[PDB]
Amino acid sequence: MAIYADNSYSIGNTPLVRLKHFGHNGNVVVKIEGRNPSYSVKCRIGANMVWQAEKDGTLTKGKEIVDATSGNTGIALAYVAAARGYKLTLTMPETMSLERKRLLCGLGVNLVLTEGAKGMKGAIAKAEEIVASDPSRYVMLKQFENPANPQIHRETTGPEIWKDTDGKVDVVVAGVGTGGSITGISRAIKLDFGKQITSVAVEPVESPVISQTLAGEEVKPGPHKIQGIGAGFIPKNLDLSIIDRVETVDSDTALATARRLMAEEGILAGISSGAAVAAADRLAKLPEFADKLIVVILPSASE
């Protein structure tokens, strides 16, 4: 009998689709994470971060959740907070989308908006103040450094990919925001299954901090339009040691690639899915990768 006790338990088992207008003779397959509650890959970590905090007893009846995300992690936490009966406060910099605002209010989130100018620094700041005022009350889950983020990917996303490809996956390409996706997936296939694949992280050309880091060059972040990736620093949840390769992609090409997936494949993907596919396309068209099954994470749906 396959009935989930709440929405949180329904995460994952997302599908593999072969691309027709990218790669070479169907060597690029996409994993659609838009097929999830809250409609993004962050549904996995929203659930496991709450579940682990429960199991270890940092989260109980009585304790509220506070955190600073201005992206899909807010939505993910919102749905899980709702599904499991927790109050949630989210901080974010006021120059956020009414649509995002409205959706979060709908999900029953307490919204604390911070000055536009001051951005995520502002929102993070104000979140820590709020914890600081009542430590026994609020718990912060911290998506950038919480090992329950990559762990879920090791337990679900990675195995799904292995199972659905009958052990044939040769390459995995994934944009990096918190790094959790590529980390967990890589640990699972390399360490748990024992296959030496090529792990490919993707970042905006506008803010190529992983690339500059590994090349021992000056880290120089910048603004970009590829929502979901390009944090402008290395997160703790990115295990550099499992990253075989790093591909950079520009905003315009990531957007266009997105529009192409829509128009040509009938795949409703977000901008970072566009960035991930652009990178994968590039490797798929090198002779060294021609006979290699390449799996790309599509993190979200449109917008």
């Binding site: 201005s70 995520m120 950038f144 910048g222 339009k225 990736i229 402008g232 997160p235």
Partner: peptide, 8 residues
């Protein structure tokens, strides 16, 4: 993730 530090 919208900004880690910077998105537009």
């Amino acid at each position: 993730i919208g900004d880690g530090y910077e998105f537009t």
